[PDB]
Design an enzyme around this catalytic site. Structure first.
Site, PDB file in Angstrom:
ATOM      1  N   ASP A   1       0.826  -1.200   0.000  1.00  0.00           N
ATOM      2  CA  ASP A   1       0.000   0.000   0.000  1.00  0.00           C
ATOM      3  C   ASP A   1       0.865   1.257   0.000  1.00  0.00           C
ATOM      4  OD1 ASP A   1      -1.910   1.913   0.276  1.00  0.00           O
ATOM      5  OD2 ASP A   1      -2.419   1.439   2.370  1.00  0.00           O
TER       6      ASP A   1
ATOM      7  N   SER B   1      -0.689  15.637 -12.007  1.00  0.00           N
ATOM      8  CA  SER B   1      -0.950  15.284 -13.385  1.00  0.00           C
ATOM      9  C   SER B   1      -1.197  16.551 -14.199  1.00  0.00           C
ATOM     10  CB  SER B   1      -2.153  14.340 -13.460  1.00  0.00           C
ATOM     11  OG  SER B   1      -2.573  14.099 -14.788  1.00  0.00           O
TER      12      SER B   1
END
Length: 330
Positions: free
Chosen positions: A35, A199
């Site tokens: 994770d 992004s």
């Protein structure tokens, strides 16, 4: 040193991935959920409340000659999906794919929430976010990666998740045969303890690319892609009959649909998520309403590039002095 381990979807939907991990001496192999959005290595154990164990493999520290109680240390964690676990702490030898760390904090669960009990395939979590998020008190502990880093050939790990198929976690090297083209690296902020990056935009299907900054985290422990409501609405508007359902808890779409792809930007590069990756199947067995793999982050407080996004790429988690993230197509 290096390590290389195969990671395997837990079910037909790729809800999560499990990777075998050797703990203790002799080895006890547990299948852990790696994770990159948390920083605790915790396991089902001989200390876990019996009624909260249902099929998991447990770590038994008393059977490990290298286990030592970390006296006074406790831990307690809550995840974004509302699940939780807590307990005490041992140090022991932990190996992943041939890479060994001695003195790793292994957090033994005394209690786990129902979601963990109900998932027989996940024996615990191995956190790979920054150690500043580790919950051990009163002495915070380091992640497996942080402990391994100095010994690694290169201070990196990579995630290569499969779509409905196994993939690979590598430590200490970049497998140049595992991706196509070049890797595009992008800046990381560690201020919130995550692999947080920005992004450069998105496209829906064959549509034009929208240049827009989307801050979010690369999180292998989250199944879906969670993005701003504007972006998500633009995606689902291209699917006839798709709608957001408050009763179901997100966007659903007719199971008869063909889903468009979704592209996200990494610098000037582009990663394309095929439409099929965005299908999470019937909302309940036999339903003709299907659950979407792109959902709104509104009210989470952060955008999450979870498995839906990451499995479309070869992803480099560069833990050099100034961390960065790399993405390549594959």
């Amino acid at each position: 040193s290096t390590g290389s381990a195969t990671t395997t979807p837990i079910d037909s939907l790729d809800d999560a991935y499990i990777t075998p991990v050797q703990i203790g001496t002799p080895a006890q192999t547990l299948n852990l959920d790696f994770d990159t959005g948390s920083s605790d290595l915790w396991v089902f154990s001989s200390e876990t409340t019996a009624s909260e164990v249902d099929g998991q493999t447990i770590y038994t520290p008393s059977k490990s000659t290298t286990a030592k109680l970390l006296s006074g240390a406790t831990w307690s964690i809550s995840y974004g999906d509302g699940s939780s676990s807590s307990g005490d702490v041992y140090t022991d030898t932990v190996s992943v794919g041939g890479l060994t760390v001695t003195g790793q904090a292994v957090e033994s669960a005394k209690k786990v929430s129902s979601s963990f009990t109900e998932d027989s395939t996940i024996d615990g979590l191995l956190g790979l976010a920054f150690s500043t998020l580790n919950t051990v008190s009163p002495t915070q502990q380091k992640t497996f990666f942080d402990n391994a880093k100095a010994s690694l050939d290169s201070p990196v790990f990579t995630a290569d998740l499969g779509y409905h198929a196994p993939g690979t976690y590598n430590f200490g090297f970049i497998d140049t045969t595992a991706y196509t083209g070049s890797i595009t690296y992008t800046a990381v902020s560690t201020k919130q303890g995550f692999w947080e990056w920005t992004s450069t935009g998105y496209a829906v299907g064959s549509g034009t690319f929208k240049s827009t900054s989307i801050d979010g985290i690369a999180d292998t422990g989250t199944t879906l892609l969670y993005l701003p409501a504007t972006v998500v609405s633009a995606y689902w508007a291209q699917v006839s009959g798709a709608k957001s359902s408050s009763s179901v808890g997100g966007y659903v779409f007719p199971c008869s649909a063909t889903l468009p792809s979704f592209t996200f930007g990494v610098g000037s590069a582009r990663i394309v998520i095929p439409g099929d990756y965005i299908d999470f199947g019937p909302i309940s067995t036999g339903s003709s309403s299907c659950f979407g793999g792109i959902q709104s982050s509104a009210g989470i407080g952060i955008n999450i590039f979870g498995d839906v996004a990451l499995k479309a790429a070869f992803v480099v988690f560069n833990g050099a002095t100034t961390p960065t993230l790399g993405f390549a197509s594959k």
